[PDB]
Each structure stands twice: as C-alpha cells, then as structure tokens.
Design a protein around this ligand. Sequence first.
Ligand SMILES: [Cu+]
Length: 105
Amino acid sequence: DKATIPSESPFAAAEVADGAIVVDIAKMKYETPELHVKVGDTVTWINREAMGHNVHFVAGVLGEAALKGPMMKKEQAYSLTFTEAGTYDYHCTPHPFMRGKVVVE
Ligand SMILES: [Cu+]
C-alpha cells in the first residue's frame, strides 16, 4: 500500500489536525485538483457543502484494491497518509466528473 488511513470514518472538520494539508470540497469540485505533497504527508479532504462527497482511487493506484473513501457529509473530513512517491488520480464515487490528483514527491 502506498497510503495509510488514519480514520476509516469521516470525522468533524473542527477535529482536523493543526497544520493539516487540506483540500476543500465545494460547488461540486475539489478546490485543489492538483495537490503536491511529500512522502509521509497526510492529506485531509473537508466537505464544505451539503451534498455528500468522497475520494476514490481505482485499483492499482494506492494499492492492489481500489481505495474508495467513505462519504463525507457537510463539515466532515477524511485523511490519507501517502507513503510512496507517485501520481495518484482520484474521483468522487457518486459524481465521477469530479476529478483530482495527489502528486507525492
Ligand atoms: Cu461528489
């Protein structure tokens, strides 16, 4: 696996770590569609709108299986810690026109 999951559950936006690397989700878009981080960094997505959203990496991207994140409700968050350099594309499961990528360097 090229990512670990701190919390399998979404969690509250106020519970996001001090200094987190945050991608906001609003207006049916990931607000940072191309994020560059370093090996070992944790990225946190935070849903800022009513509509449920997740992040979904298909099989072979972050590991053998697809990494289909849990649906985040409004003001919920979800983190992934990236452990290997590469380019990792993702989309939103119910709204697959929403696309982003994490580039881990
Ligand atoms: Cu979505």
